[PDB]
C-alpha cells in the first residue's frame, strides 16, 4: 500500500528452516491471510531462508484437479496452493522444500504474474526405489540387490514393496544405470524387475529367485518403479505470465513441471536434476521433467539442467479431440479419448480450429472458429470428457464421424518456443518432444547420453491423441553425444520426425513442414542421424558427424538418413569425420 512490494520474510511469521515441523498447515493459513488482504493491484513476495522446510499431508488443502498427461486420482494432496492470487513471488536462498507422502508440492491455479525463484523441491522418500546389483548368477537367475540407505521396504508374500508416509507400492519395471557415468545401460530401456519371488538375505539385501538378465552386472544401479504418475512437482493451470528462475525439482510422483492452458512461461535455470557429483541418487522425476499441454504465448526454457528423469526433458503439445457425433452443419460432439488427458477445458469462443482425417493424418485446409463450447455433464459432479462445439462456418459434409475417424486440433492454444543452452542427459525415452505449428528455436543445447533419440516431432490422433503438425522449427548449434543407446517408441534416429500414421501408403498430404536442422554436431557410435516421415520442407545443412566406438553399432536402421513420404529436402555442407556427404 505505502509499499511498492509487501515482502513477508517467512521466519517473522512463525515459519523457520530446519525446525523439522510440519510447515504445511502454517504456510497454508498464512497465504490465506495474505491473500484475504492483498488486492489484485497489490504486489506480494513470500521469502524462505537458507535451510530445510518439511511439508506433510496433514493440514494440506485437498483440491480435485484434472492434470494433462497424468493419472486422475482425486482429490490431490496439495502442499502449497497459489490459487487466484496475482503478482506473487515465492523466493528462497538455497531453500530445500522437502515433501512427505503422496503430495502435489506446488499448484499455481488461475493466477497471473507469478514468479518462483531460488527454491528446490524434493521428497524424502521417492516412490522410485534405488537398488544396487550385488551378485548376479546368470545360470540360476539369482540376483541379490542392495536397497539404498534411505529406502524403507516391506516384504509380504515374497513380494517387494517400497514404502513412505501413508503409501506402499510394488515396483513392476525399472531403468538400469552404469555405475559412475550414471548413463543408462546399452540396449536396456524398460526392463522387468525381480520384485516377485523375493526373500531377505540381511537388512537391505534382497534375493530375487527368478530374475535373468546378463546385463545387470554387479555395480549396476536400478531405479525400480511402477507406471503410476498421480501428481507433478509443479502443476500450473490457466496461468498468465509465469516465471521460474533457478528452481530445481529433484523428484516427484509425476512430471517435474506440468503447465496447461497457460499463456506465457519464462524459465531461466529450471532444473530437474541431481544435487551434483555427490548425489547418491541416479534418478529424478517419475515422468517428464517439463511438460506443456495446450499452452500459448511464448515459452522460454533456457540454461536448465535435466538429468536422470524417467521420461523426456520437455514435451510441448496439444490434445486432438475425436468427433463422436455430428448434430448439424455447425455443431459436433467431440470427446477426450486418452485416460491420462481429460477433465480440463479445451477451447474458448473465437479459437481457430482445424480438422484431421485420423486414419491418414491429413488436415482439411478449411479452418473454423469456435462459436460456442460447453462440456456435456449428466451429473453436476462429473469430469469433462465430452464437449458440444459450435463453429461459425458450416462444415463440408466430408466432416462426418460416421464416414471416418475425425479429430480437431485447437490452433489457438499453441505456444511459440525458445529452448536454448540447456543440458539433457542420462534420461529414459527421448530428450525433447516438440509438437507446435508456432515458431520454435532449439539451440545451443547439450544432449549428453540420452537413452533414446535426442529430439522427436510426433503427432498422433489414434492412440495418445497429442497434437503437433510442426510448421516452423530451427534445430541449430546443438551437440548430440552418443544418443540412442536404447530403443523406445519412435527411436529411429538421433533426430526422429515420426508422426503416428496408421495408413501411410494412401496419405497425399505431408503432416509436418518447415523443419530446419543447421550447424549441429553429432557424436555417434552408430549410423542413424535423421529419420523423417511425412514432411514437406526439410533442411539439413552445415552439420558435422563425428564417429566414435564408445559402444557397438546395433540399430536395425543402418542408414544415416531414412526418408518416408518426404519432399522439399535441402542437404548441403554436411560432413562425416571431416569428409563431405552429398546427395548429388
Numbering used by the authors: 34 to 617
Question: What does the report in the manuscript say about this coordinate set?
Answer:
The B antigen that is present on red blood cells (RBCs) of type B only differs from the H antigen that defines type O by the terminal galactose unit connected by an α‐1,3‐glycosidic bond to the sub‐terminal galactose. Thus, removal of this additional galactose yields the H antigen of blood type O. For this, we characterized several previously unstudied α‐1,3‐galactosidases belonging to the GH110 family. Analysis of the structures revealed that the core β‐helix of PpaGal is surrounded by two small β‐barrel domains (domains I and II) as it is typical for enzymes of the GH110 family.
Additionally, a stacking geometry via CH‐π‐interaction between the galactose and the tryptophan W497 was found, which often occurs in CAZymes. Interestingly the position of this tryptophan residue shifts if no galactose is bound. Therefore, this specific tryptophan residue which is also highly conserved, seems to have a “gating function” for the substrate. Furthermore, two crystal structures of PpaGal in its galactose free and galactose‐bound state were solved.
